[PDB]
Design a protein around this ligand. Structure first.
Ligand SMILES: Nc1ncnc2c1ncn2[C@@H]1O[C@H](COP(=O)(O)OP(=O)(O)O)[C@@H](O)[C@H]1O
Length: 488
């Protein structure tokens, strides 16, 4: 009931963030700390971070051949030991395994060779009685490395490791010839062994970090009970890949959100701050502000749909694009924000091209506009092919922007038909294709939603969306309940 928890991962918010691998490592740790636990977060140091004080300690780490020395910078925040692995690989305007071999290894060092009494309730060295939580493929090998170099000769021993699957789309798939460069022994080789892209003319033996991660760990996890069930089942399509393997007894906990960064009542990018009680009328102002900014006609009576995502197959921009002509039979505005492929970037761009005054396709990392979008949009459209957690709909609801979404993944957990949004049905999972039945559902659902807008029930829906707790408080209790199971 009083465990030491060490979180490892490539990205770590606020410092190194892009996808919701960042947010997870930024928010879950302190929430877990606030539950009276010794909680640490090891991740690489990508830049010369300000509150990042070198604690001088250095390990030397065996990578391929070269013996590599790492610096350990520290910053101790929010009840949480934030540790940063320093090294010149971690600064690059290939040698990809190297860096994260570094990472997993260094992360095995910081628990012992660091004395850190900053915590008012816990002193000394973290110990060798740990629970490791490994995140995404980048940390796969850690479980392995621990059994290789520690458990045989008395170090850690009764410790355990949980592997968290943030997105099955990225597995860390490498040449099988590159194996030995991990200074792990053959026993573990079999766990990495992968037959990639079978039957297709590109099939090839491969090394798979996630696979290793998954197979070697004491407990496996993902970011959503429905996603867990989608995997355990068969739907395990990471798009290009499929099933990877008969996944076994995996466990899913819905993510929380960074409720401080996204807080309509304190947000500083948007024209009008609000809570649930003034949402409707402030959202109108934000909406018009948005309408201007997007050079669309300013009119609060026009329902505005929003799409915000990386323009990749997983987030269904092609599908969104196909549905536009249909929706343009209605008096509605659609604002899309994201950046990804070319084919999609121009798919949307052509849509703006065809209906100006009604469609605006924006292509950039405009964080300010995302906020503005969240504040002013009436519905968020999230036609995902697959969706492990989803941060966009959590953000949306926080801002009272109900969601019309694909009935896949974490959206099934977080978006309730009638209370906080509108399910669309599940989309064809053949990423490379655009099912006309899908184009139909998407269109259809969006039409319903926009018809709801600006009616009493809609305002209730908004209120529901705002009145949830989407902090890490509830999540963190679920996580710990799992980290309990692990005996340590
Ligand atoms: N153009 C953009 N500008 C600002 N933020 C963006 C943009 N595109 C995506 N995002 C943010 O990144 C996320 C998109 O999906 P993401 O969570 O990265 O999926 P995954 O974690 O599976 O990679 C959203 O949560 C959104 O807030």
């Amino acid at each position: 009931h009083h465990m030491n928890v060490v979180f490892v991962g490539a990205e770590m918010a606020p410092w190194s963030k892009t996808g919701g691998l960042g947010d997870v490592l930024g928010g879950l740790p302190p929430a877990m700390a606030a539950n009276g636990h010794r909680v640490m977060v090891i991740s690489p140091r990508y830049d010369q971070y300000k509150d990042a004080w070198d604690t001088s300690v250095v390990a030397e780490i065996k990578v391929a051949d070269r013996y590599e020395r790492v610096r350990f910078f520290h910053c101790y925040k929010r009840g949480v030991d934030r540790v940063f692995i320093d090294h010149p690989s971690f600064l690059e305007k290939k040698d990809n395994q190297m860096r994260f071999s570094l990472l997993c290894q260094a992360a095995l060092e910081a628990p012992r060779i660091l004395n850190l009494n900053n915590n008012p309730y816990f002193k000394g060295t973290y110990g060798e009685d740990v629970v490791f939580v490994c995140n995404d493929w980048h940390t796969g090998p850690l479980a392995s490395y621990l059994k290789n170099n520690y458990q045989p000769n008395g170090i850690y021993r009764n410790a355990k490791v949980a592997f968290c699957i943030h997105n099955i789309s990225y597995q860390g798939r490498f040449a099988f010839e590159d194996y030995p460069e991990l200074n792990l022994s053959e026993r573990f080789r079999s766990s990495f062994d992968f037959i990639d892209g079978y039957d297709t003319p590109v099939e090839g033996r491969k090394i798979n970090w996630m696979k290793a991660g998954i197979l070697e760990a004491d407990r496996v996890l993902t970011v959503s009970p429905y996603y867990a069930e989608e995997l355990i089942s068969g739907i395990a399509r990471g798009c290009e890949l499929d099933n990877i393997m008969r996944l076994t007894g995996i466990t899913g906990i819905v993510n929380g959100m960074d409720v401080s960064e996204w807080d309509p009542s304190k947000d500083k990018y948007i024209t009008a701050k609000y809570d649930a009680t003034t949402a409707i009328e402030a959202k109108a102002l934000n909406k018009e502000a948005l309408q201007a900014e997007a050079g669309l006609p300013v009119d609060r009576k026009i329902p505005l749909i929003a799409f915000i995502g990386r323009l990749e197959e997983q987030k269904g921009p092609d599908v969104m694009a196909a549905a536009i002509p249909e929706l343009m039979q209605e008096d509605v505005q659609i604002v899309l924000l994201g950046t990804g492929k070319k084919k999609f970037e121009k798919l949307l761009k052509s849509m703006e091209e065809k209906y100006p005054g009604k469609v605006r396709a924006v292509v950039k990392f405009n964080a300010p506009l995302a906020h503005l979008i969240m504040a002013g949009a009436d519905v968020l459209a999230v036609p995902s092919r697959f969706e492990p957690c989803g941060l966009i709909q959590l953000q949306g609801m926080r801002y009272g922007t109900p969601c019309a979404c694909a009935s896949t993944g974490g959206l099934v957990d977080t978006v309730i038909e009638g209370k906080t949004g509108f399910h669309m049905g599940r989309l064809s999972v053949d990423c490379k294709v655009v099912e006309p039945s899908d184009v139909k559902k998407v269109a259809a659902t969006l039409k319903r939603a926009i018809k709801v807008v600006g009616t009493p029930a809609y305002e209730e829906m908004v209120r529901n969306c705002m009145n949830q707790d989407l902090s890490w408080k509830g999540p963190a209790k679920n996580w710990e309940n799992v980290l309990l199971g692990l005996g340590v």
